[PDB]
Amino acid sequence: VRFTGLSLKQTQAIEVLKGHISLPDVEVAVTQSDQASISIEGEEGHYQLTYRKPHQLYRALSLLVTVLAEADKVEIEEQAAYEDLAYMVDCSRNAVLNVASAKQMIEILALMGYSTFELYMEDTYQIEGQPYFGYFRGAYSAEELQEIEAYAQQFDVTFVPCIQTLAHLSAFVKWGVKEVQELRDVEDILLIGEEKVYDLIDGMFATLSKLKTRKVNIGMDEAHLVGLGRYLILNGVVDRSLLMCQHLERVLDIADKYGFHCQMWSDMFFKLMSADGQYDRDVEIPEETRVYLDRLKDRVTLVYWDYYQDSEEKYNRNFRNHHKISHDLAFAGGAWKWIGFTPHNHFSRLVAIEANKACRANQIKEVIVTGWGDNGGETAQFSILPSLQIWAELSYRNDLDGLSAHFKTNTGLTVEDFMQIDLANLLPDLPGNLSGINPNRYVFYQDILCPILDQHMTPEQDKPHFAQAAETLANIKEKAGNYAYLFETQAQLNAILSSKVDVGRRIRQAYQADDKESLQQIARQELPELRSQIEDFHALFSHQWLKENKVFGLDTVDIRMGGLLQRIKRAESRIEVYLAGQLDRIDELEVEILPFTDFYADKDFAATTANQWHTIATASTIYTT
Amino acid sequence: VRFTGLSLKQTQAIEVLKGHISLPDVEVAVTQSDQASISIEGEEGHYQLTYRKPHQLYRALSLLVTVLAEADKVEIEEQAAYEDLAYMVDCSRNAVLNVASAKQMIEILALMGYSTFELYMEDTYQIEGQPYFGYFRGAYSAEELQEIEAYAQQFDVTFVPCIQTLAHLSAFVKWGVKEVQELRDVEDILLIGEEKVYDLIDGMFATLSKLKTRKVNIGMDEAHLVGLGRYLILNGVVDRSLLMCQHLERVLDIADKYGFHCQMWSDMFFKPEETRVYLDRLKDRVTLVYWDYYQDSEEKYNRNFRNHHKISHDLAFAGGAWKWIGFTPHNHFSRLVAIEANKACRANQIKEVIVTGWGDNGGETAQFSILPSLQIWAELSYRNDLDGLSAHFKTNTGLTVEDFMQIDLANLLPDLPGNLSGINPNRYVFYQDILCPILDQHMTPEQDKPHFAQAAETLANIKEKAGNYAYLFETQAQLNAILSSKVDVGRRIRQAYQADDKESLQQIARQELPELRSQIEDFHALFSHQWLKENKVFGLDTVDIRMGGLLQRIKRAESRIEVYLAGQLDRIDELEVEILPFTDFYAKDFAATTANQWHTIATASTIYTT
Ligand SMILES: CC(=O)N[C@@H]1[C@@H](O)[C@H](O)[C@@H](CO)O[C@H]1O
Numbered sequence A: 001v002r003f004t005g006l007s008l009k010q011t012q013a014i015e016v017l018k019g020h021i022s023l024p025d026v027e028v029a030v031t032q033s034d035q036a037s038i039s040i041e042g043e044e045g046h047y048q049l050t051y052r053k054p055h056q057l058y059r060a061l062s063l064l065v066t067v068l069a070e071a072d073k074v075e076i077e078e079q080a081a082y083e084d085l086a087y088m089v090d091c092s093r094n095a096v097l098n099v100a101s102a103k104q105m106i107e108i109l110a111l112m113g114y115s116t117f118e119l120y121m122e123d124t125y126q127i128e129g130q131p132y133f134g135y136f137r138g139a140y141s142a143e144e145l146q147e148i149e150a151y152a153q154q155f156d157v158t159f160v161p162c163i164q165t166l167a168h169l170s171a172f173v174k175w176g177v178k179e180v181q182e183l184r185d186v187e188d189i190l191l192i193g194e195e196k197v198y199d200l201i202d203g204m205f206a207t208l209s210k211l212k213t214r215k216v217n218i219g220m221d222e223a224h225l226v227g228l229g230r231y232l233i234l235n236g237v238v239d240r241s242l243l244m245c246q247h248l249e250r251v252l253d254i255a256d257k258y259g260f261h262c263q264m265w266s267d268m269f270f271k272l273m274s275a276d277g278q279y280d281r282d283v284e285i286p287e288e289t290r291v292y293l294d295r296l297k298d299r300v301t302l303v304y305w306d307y308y309q310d311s312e313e314k315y316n317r318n319f320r321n322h323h324k325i326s327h328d329l330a331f332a333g334g335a336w337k338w339i340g341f342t343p344h345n346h347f348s349r350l351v352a353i354e355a356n357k358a359c360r361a362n363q364i365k366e367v368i369v370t371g372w373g374d375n376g377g378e379t380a381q382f383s384i385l386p387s388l389q390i391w392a393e394l395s396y397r398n399d400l401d402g403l404s405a406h407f408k409t410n411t412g413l414t415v416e417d418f419m420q421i422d423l424a425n426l427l428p429d430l431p432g433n434l435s436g437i438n439p440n441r442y443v444f445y446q447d448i449l450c451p452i453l454d455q456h457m458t459p460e461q462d463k464p465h466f467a468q469a470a471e472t473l474a475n476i477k478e479k480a481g482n483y484a485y486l487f488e489t490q491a492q493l494n495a496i497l498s499s500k501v502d503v504g505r506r507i508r509q510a511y512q513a514d515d516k517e518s519l520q521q522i523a524r525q526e527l528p529e530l531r532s533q534i535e536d537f538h539a540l541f542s543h544q545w546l547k548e549n550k551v552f553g554l555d556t557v558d559i560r561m562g563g564l565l566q567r568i569k570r571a572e573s574r575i576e577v578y579l580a581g582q583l584d585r586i587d588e589l590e591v592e593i594l595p596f597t598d599f600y601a602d603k604d605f606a607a608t609t610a611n612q613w614h615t616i617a618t619a620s621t622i623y624t625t
Numbered sequence B: 001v002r003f004t005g006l007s008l009k010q011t012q013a014i015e016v017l018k019g020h021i022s023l024p025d026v027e028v029a030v031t032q033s034d035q036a037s038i039s040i041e042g043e044e045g046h047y048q049l050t051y052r053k054p055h056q057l058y059r060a061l062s063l064l065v066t067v068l069a070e071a072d073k074v075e076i077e078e079q080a081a082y083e084d085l086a087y088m089v090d091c092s093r094n095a096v097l098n099v100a101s102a103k104q105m106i107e108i109l110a111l112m113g114y115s116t117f118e119l120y121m122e123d124t125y126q127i128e129g130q131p132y133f134g135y136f137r138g139a140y141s142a143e144e145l146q147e148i149e150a151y152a153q154q155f156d157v158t159f160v161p162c163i164q165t166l167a168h169l170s171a172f173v174k175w176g177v178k179e180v181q182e183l184r185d186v187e188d189i190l191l192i193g194e195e196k197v198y199d200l201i202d203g204m205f206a207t208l209s210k211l212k213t214r215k216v217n218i219g220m221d222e223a224h225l226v227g228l229g230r231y232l233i234l235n236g237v238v239d240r241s242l243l244m245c246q247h248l249e250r251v252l253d254i255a256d257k258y259g260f261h262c263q264m265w266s267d268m269f270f271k272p273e274e275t276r277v278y279l280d281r282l283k284d285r286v287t288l289v290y291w292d293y294y295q296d297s298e299e300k301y302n303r304n305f306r307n308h309h310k311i312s313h314d315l316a317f318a319g320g321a322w323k324w325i326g327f328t329p330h331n332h333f334s335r336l337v338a339i340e341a342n343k344a345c346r347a348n349q350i351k352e353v354i355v356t357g358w359g360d361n362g363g364e365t366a367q368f369s370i371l372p373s374l375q376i377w378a379e380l381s382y383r384n385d386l387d388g389l390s391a392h393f394k395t396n397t398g399l400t401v402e403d404f405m406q407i408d409l410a411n412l413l414p415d416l417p418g419n420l421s422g423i424n425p426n427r428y429v430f431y432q433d434i435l436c437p438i439l440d441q442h443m444t445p446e447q448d449k450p451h452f453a454q455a456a457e458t459l460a461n462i463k464e465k466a467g468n469y470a471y472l473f474e475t476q477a478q479l480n481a482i483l484s485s486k487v488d489v490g491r492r493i494r495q496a497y498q499a500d501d502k503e504s505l506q507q508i509a510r511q512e513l514p515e516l517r518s519q520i521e522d523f524h525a526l527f528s529h530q531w532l533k534e535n536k537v538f539g540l541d542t543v544d545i546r547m548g549g550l551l552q553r554i555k556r557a558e559s560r561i562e563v564y565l566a567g568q569l570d571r572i573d574e575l576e577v578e579i580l581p582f583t584d585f586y587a588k589d590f591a592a593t594t595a596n597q598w599h600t601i602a603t604a605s606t607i608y609t610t
């Protein structure tokens, strides 16, 4: 290609992006213009390209490459619905995105049209004088954060840290030293009102002030027991909505000291002022609280987060409730990658289409796409590219007509191929519109002898589904280039699930039937092979993890998978003891299996949602004293 | 041995106890008498033996066997200080004592002089119509509880169930079904005021009423978050002491319905005029239990007794047989505190002592690990001294009390003050990671390595003397063998790495760590044999998970070193993190500490949280 109008910064950015896309040999005149987010016009190898904001050059080039593969004449104009579109990576659930992968992610977000890159870090950034904060977690140094931000700046992409200034600090407050314990209210919540807490928070902002950015998400979601622990012991019973405002004021004051403009998750206002303590609800605002909120609302952007609703009207109602507090709002949607090993791009697509309608209908200026990693970060960081492309398409075009072509330009894969990554969750009898159904994870981590999720399995449909999935994913792996690792991991997982889905039930059927030959084959053949397959899965998982993330946090997966392997060994040994006539009965197998949960009991499929490792793996105590 | 004066019941009991003690070739005349708890006299192969309470026959027999080893003429008289002496086994922390082992424990308690046997069961007894209560936990059936109680009765020992009627029901309330969730306030706490909660509690007493006993410990400590969860959302703010009162009244009413008389922990009374009056009313219906496992001085117990007596004189004392700090008990520390507690209980007219055998965080210590602590409490009750401790112990077990107490060794680091509780290197040295050894500051390899090595040899020798108890010492010998190398393996990896001594890193990765894994798998085998001997199979799974996890982490240490050695890694990031103190709890002229949650020993990462 021959470009005119480019700055050195822009030519360098394009050099980097040539690692993702091939620019045709054509002539392109590039200028900034307020006329459109993106405009591309021309024919016969001579083109005029304009962008409104500098970062939008990179989506413009993605569109260019795409459109020119087919046609000679180009007529493209896009007007983005959102002033800012962000992707937030969870770096607090054990998986800290490594610097090299943050760079890759930035390049991709640039090509997609995102303005903003965000990292969610509860304790995973280093604070001078707080040596337990992020200790052995791979917390980013100030230097690493600076390097990441400066790399985003190469593409005119803004960096926004998402931190926690109230709750969700469990990995820090666990440390049994005076300087940490003195900071606690209860659970994962800091002690409102305590000077040492505000010293800590001043440290947080001191660290972030080393960056160029002066935009921050300060957290404050999900502090359900706020004011009810050591706070209650010291202060007695207080108005908790005012308590929230008091803490918020002090944090905004600290932010001000460093020149930051803040956003926060909105849920605690709703939980503390609704009838049943829930988010998705209307609120009675006490007068003294209203007055306090009327001040504070001018100093912070409230972020309404919702990853779940299947209809615009459901989001709309919540936006309406938020308007009672503030018209300075943003929306956080979901790239579903927090339900085990396997994402749910399909469900993310369904909710994105409807959330986009509601955001537009409520003149929402910013959408943050969230990539949470609940309970260990076991899903791949790059597993949700389709979901990111979907939101970009919805902002820029208000439809998904360009989704597959732009996605193929950006990744080398069709969007439908890449979205097969979801397969371990896609049981055939599920409706598309229910969230969190995650057999990928609970079929994997379930015990053998004591399979407490067995009532949720449907082997006649699930076995062939997982088996077919493994073949499909093996095929996509072969044409996935640099993303092949993602698919190889999923293929092996599905291969394991195909047999593991009912091995526990088949053991019980054979035991009840006195089919000792079957018992023997399971214990001597099937289970040692299952261990072999799990060890291979562990290797592939580790390869994936170390490619994307820092090493810290992988230890939890080692522990979990080692435990699973040992429990398979126990199934083998207990069966052998019984077969050698050294047991009259195998007591584990005499316990009748109950439903694990009734969450989806009223629905016409067996699968469910089960997303805590420690309750998947055992009915015994493991966490409690 | 020829006896006169025995019933059929007593004859059969003695026949069982021959499994434990060797009755010499003498004639013994047995009668009940109020003159003493135990009296024995006679000479030249003719003896007169008296007991006050029927169960005390069995301690008397142990005393008799003992003295006659030494002498012909006997003049024994004991007056026990406590009306009741109980041992309470924890069956809620994953380890549910199996029926055969409960029988063994009863036999030993009878020989020692215990009047009462207790099982602590949060969710580990079955309630008809509550299928999730004890599900996959090895919950005792009604019939199993009856059989255990009946066995105790064979020796005139009474049974007391220890249950929970408000909080500490974590293993039950986790179940995500309507019939369970509607019973919940928050965390491990049931929902006060909910009629379905009182339906459950009625169910609890319906099960226990199948027993002969009408004495129960109902739990009822003061959990901080009572009233603060789904209670707060449903009902607004209430005085939470007043809430405790309302719930306690309902529980007591249910217990009355079934004829039970209740004990409970004294916590909620420790300390609004509405509340004072309510508390005062309820205190008349219960015996309070003051529990203390920690104090090193009678003076400190006495202070707490005085304070309790401002609340109620209807008071019992719970002491501690330290078996809740990992794999290895602390009989030594239990002896220290028993001596002082006994002084204080006597000074304050305490009528009942309950020795507690908690199994905190997985039940990994052997059920029979604390026999010395139990004999200690018996001697203190009956004789007010330990001058006959070892001789009586050896009659009962085959082992001197000093030999048996070597079971503690994995905790007994040389530079520890004997009077500080919960220092448990047995556990955190074992479960600590290799690459990220977050307890390394608490290790003193130059002292700890030979201590653990010498312990393993000592324990191998005691195993040979231990008969039916050998399994306990075999387990502990192997643990100490492991800890001798593991205590500093992470540190030696860091040293070799920092010195760029690749030969040493290779030796550690290729020889030492695979051998460590082999040793841990050996320990796992021995531990499993020990567990299955003493306990139901349920709960063993948690140990399998924890140990399989540790093995996999040792594998990671091997593989990370291999990749580095091969040039495919510029650095091993885990090894570049400076290790801080794990806790400042005992920050001191020793480095050891207390760390008793597996999940925080094993990783600085999240593992339970969302
Ligand atoms: C602000 C927010 O969304 N908070 C939590 C988040 O930590 C969790 O990871 C996510 C996905 O389950 O949803 C919420 O429960």
Ligand SMILES: CC(=O)N[C@@H]1[C@@H](O)[C@H](O)[C@@H](CO)O[C@H]1O
Pocket (backbone or CB within 6 Å): B221, B265, B291, B324, B358, B359, B360
């Ligand atoms: C009444 C009582 O003793 N309650 C707990 C008990 O559940 C625990 O196992 C034990 C040993 O640490 O100490 C107490 O805190």
